[model samples]
Target: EPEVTAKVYFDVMIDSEPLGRITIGLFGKDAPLTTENFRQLCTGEHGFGYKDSIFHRVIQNFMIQGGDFTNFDGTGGKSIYGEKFADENLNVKHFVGALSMANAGPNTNGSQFFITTAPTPWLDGAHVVFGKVLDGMDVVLRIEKTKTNSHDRPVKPVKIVASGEL
Candidate 1:
């Protein structure tokens, strides 16, 4: 079988100065479908559409989650795609900066995704982790400190400047 590689980029601009960047490496060897789904979103026009999205959910020292097409009300926005193939990447651990598929339940994954701030072992066997940060981890650490509203929306928008394969 031919293996594919996918990368998700986060431009990560906060104030003005280029804060940094985060590029997620999707393991084509494992979660092929989920990885490909992410690849499509990143390559499609919807790629930049994810820019202004809010994190929506965040936990101190644990994980910062976002990518809801619903944007929080759990309704509205475009679907990343439809269909969740099997969870082929079964044993992947949820470590810091780990990227995962967000679903209403298993196999419902779409435009939604999350980045971990700390190890999330509780998520094991429940979520499909397709990627991890290869650079700008320090920038991710800085982003972890941004202020948020009660709804977990960042007080200041953190836009994804650009994303692509490296």
Candidate 2:
């Protein structure tokens, strides 16, 4: 079968408040494996949905990372296939509000992901950028300002109320 190139939009909410939404534009085109893994995780096809998951890691002026369904902490989470996927080498940059996968290192993408609050050029070639904030970037900024511990976990839980394709 041939590949399908279609963008997917995700509606996100934090703490029952409507945060905003993001659109994954280069999914099947640039980052097939990375995108499919995320899509599955979002739809519960990965055996778990991202709903109720906390934005486990938040660094002010940097990025907000989450998607650890198995463990609320940053130490655990697996893809739909129960393993990591290789880097898709997409040309997307880690500009402010850029949505990308959160990996331990090279080609370690799983269910974790992050959104940049500021331009992070250093992340280029290291993370796979599959989406961007189409709206609600201000919401992302608000999430960035949240109080956190030394480990960057939000003191007040920033929950993902729900996630689904639009």
Candidate 3:
């Protein structure tokens, strides 16, 4: 059981301002590799991490996706296991505030993950559900309500200014 707390200073247009910290908990006991990958990435001890990374995809009432340190616009993967890694058979269910991996297909997880704002039963075994928000959910809900464009991208970048193992 490890957690990473990220403090974000959002610079939004007009009134999308709210500075808060998001604490995320990973299931290290269940999935060691996946959890370790996230842990090291958060600390940037492996030279690639989630620090100063933007939430490239944020759909209101759906999910807030980030962790793509390689590409800001959701286009790359800098996994510690090279380009990508296999998925863990996590036994967690998808509910509000779920922290799951964002993959291209089966076993394609990398440095991208998302936090669900509502119940998402549709994504159970399909996605690697390995973590959840431990605190500062209000900040996540705030991000969920942020203005987005036609592409489901936040109008103002909601970035993880700093993140690391806690």
Candidate 4:
């Protein structure tokens, strides 16, 4: 028999202030492995925790990405599974507010993930759409519109002060 779990939400904060919360749903059912890996990381079972991690990459009108708590530079992070897992063919689209995994190339997904500020069809079938902003897209947009440097890193750090089931 398959085990069932309750719905989960990731509460976010920026600079020690409440940002909003994102409810994770479809990805858990369609991509259990990836979702479980993310769940573990959010709970700190993974060596690199998500709490207090910076949203290291912020591109105006694009997406706000993070999860590289190890480096806070978008180049470091790993799944609790200890390796890259096969992408789940969930058939989900990269619409606005879509939450997707970030990878170096094909099947290189790790701890990095992003929240889209606008529809990104070009990303379809390339990245894994694991979740979406169930609420508080306004906050997601606020992070997307934040000022960034030449490298797209936020001029002022935006941190994920906490992540857990609601």
Task: For each candidate, give its TM-score against the true structure.
Answer: 0.80, 0.85, 0.87, 0.87
Worst 10 residues of 2 by lDDT: 1-10
Candidate 2: segments with Cα more than 4 A from true spot: 1-26
Candidate 2 accuracy as TM-score: 0.85
lDDT at residue 99 of model 3 (Cα atoms): 79
Q: Candidate 3: TM-score?
A: 0.87
**Stronger candidate by lDDT (2 vs 3):** 3
Which 10 successive residues of model 3 have the least lDDT summed? 6-15
Candidate 3, residue 57: how far the Cα is off, in Å: 0.7
> Which residue segments of model 3 deviate by more than 4 Å?
1-18
Best to worst by TM-score, what's the order?
A: 3, 4, 2, 1
* Full-model lDDT for every candidate: 0.67, 0.75, 0.76, 0.75
| Per-residue error (Å), model 4, residue 136 | 1.3
What clash count does candidate 1 reach? 0
The candidate with the higher lDDT, 1 or 4, is: 4
- Candidate 1 ranges beyond 4 A from true positions: 1-4, 15-17, 45-52, 69-80, 83-88
